[PDB]
Amino acid sequence: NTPKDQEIKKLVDQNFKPLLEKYDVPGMAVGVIQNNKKYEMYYGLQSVQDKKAVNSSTIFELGSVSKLFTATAGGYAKNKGKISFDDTPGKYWKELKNTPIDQVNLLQLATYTSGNLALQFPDEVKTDQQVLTFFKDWKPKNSIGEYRQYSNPSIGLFGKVVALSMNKPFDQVLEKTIFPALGLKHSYVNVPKTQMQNYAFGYNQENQPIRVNPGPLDAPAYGVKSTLPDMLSFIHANLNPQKYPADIQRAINETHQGRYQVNTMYQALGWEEFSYPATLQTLLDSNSEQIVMKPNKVTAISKEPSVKMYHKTGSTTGFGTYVVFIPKENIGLVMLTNKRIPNEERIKAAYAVLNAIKK
């Protein structure tokens, strides 16, 4: 006896709204798409000092959810014949030819199995020449392809090679090719001056206003900004890839293909993948310190899950993101905040909402 849009708003109020007070978060956007119908819920302020309300135009930093766009770009290049995932980086970045890193193939870079690449570049690697020197100085540790360690330099180098194969800077690969193909008109690597008024402040742990700073290969690792409507469209594209031209369709499907497992988690291209229904602990394990911060030996996929779900967390110093979608339920959810909150809370809140929505 209650309209569906009110039912979903109530669920988001019950499970996401309390996080605002609990973590002193200034602003939040939550969206649900179910059976091609979109539901948008905005809370709080995109700028505290300006008393500017979060709304459909608010631009948030996606953090590592940006890696999903990097993976789509690589899937696009691969299916256009510009790269093979068996290639090594020196085929495209010629100065890496005959260096040790040129023994690692593009899939291994994209899925974090070089065997010796940490979460971040060293603090002092900043310039283009310093990034090149860092990879020229790279030497193997663990056997290549056997150990997963979540790594910005790893997928950053993949993104750089994808851009080289397409004869464009990476920011242009997204803003001129991939965002238009996905129908995203309010998504940016670099937010233009004409849109800065819509760029939220992020807020650090002292609730001080901040925004992301430049860093090495930032764009492919964590450098996309977007709005809730654009992120719901992105979820829509992942739920309905057969509604895009052949090259973009195949690119999206590329990001859904599991490549190896670490226990219950399947590493796809950018996306993390799970058998569905997934237990809460399966989803929480994917965010454990053991999985996120340490190397873990990988194993071949044994059960290729017919029914599955995908998710990805992302953070910058001042923003939190979570995206999740379940193809066979034709449903997905996006959470954007301009303050970080624990990944476990994002996963729990989305799990409660998605399981409670009437089918």
What residues are annotated to the active site? 64, 150
Q: Is 113 in the site for ligand KJK (CB under 6 A)?
A: no
Cα separation, 262 vs 221, whole angstroms: 21
User: What does the per-residue mask of binding to ligand KJK show for 147-186, with x meaning CB under 6 A?
Assistant: -----x----------------------------------
Q: Which stretch binds ligand KJK (CB under 6 A): 126-134, 214-222, 232-240, 294-302?
A: 214-222
Tokens, residue 169: 């800077």
**Strand, helix or coil at 244?**
coil
Binding to ligand KJK, residues 316-335 (CB under 6 A): 316-317
Residue 222 contacts ligand KJK per CB under 6 A = yes
Shortest distance in whole angstroms from residue 221 CB to ligand KJK: 6
Q: Is 338 in the site for ligand KJK (CB under 6 A)?
A: no
Annotate 118-183 with DSSP letters as a single string: -SS--TT--SHHHHHHHHHT----SPTTSEE---HHHHHHHHHHHHHHTTS-HHHIIIIIIHHHTT
Binding mask 263-292 toward ligand KJK (x if CB under 6 A, else -) reads ------------------------------
Q: Which amino acid is at 6?
A: Q
Q: Do 265 and 291 touch, CB atoms closer than 8 A? A: yes
Helical residues (DSSP H) of the chain, grouped into ranges: 4-15, 17-23, 66-79, 106-110, 128-136, 152-165, 170-172, 179-181, 218-222, 228-239, 246-256, 280-285, 289-293, 343-356
Contact pattern from residue 48 through residue 77 relative to ligand KJK, giving x for each residue in contact according to CB under 6 A and a dash for the rest: ---------------xx-------------
44, 100, 145, 215: which one contacts ligand KJK (CB under 6 A)?
215
Given the complex with ligand KJK, which of 73 and 155 has the nearer CB atom?
155
Assess 315 for contact with ligand KJK (CB under 6 A).
Answer: yes
343 makes contact with ligand KJK (CB under 6 A) = yes
Report whether the peptide linkage leading into residue 295 is cis, meaning its omega lies within 30 degrees of zero.
Answer: no
Q: 332 and 32 in contact (C-beta within 8 Å)?
A: yes
142 binds ligand KJK (CB under 6 A): no
Residue 123 CB contacts under 8 Å (≥ 6 apart), including other chains: none
* 337 DSSP β-pair partners: 28, 320
CB of 217 to ligand KJK, least distance (A): 10
| Chain position whose Cβ is nearest to ligand KJK | 64
Judged by CB under 6 A, the number of residues near ligand KJK is 13
Angle at 343 between CA 321 and CA 125, to 5 degrees: 70
Q: Which residues are near ligand KJK by CB under 6 A?
A: 63-64, 152, 212, 215, 221-222, 313-317, 343
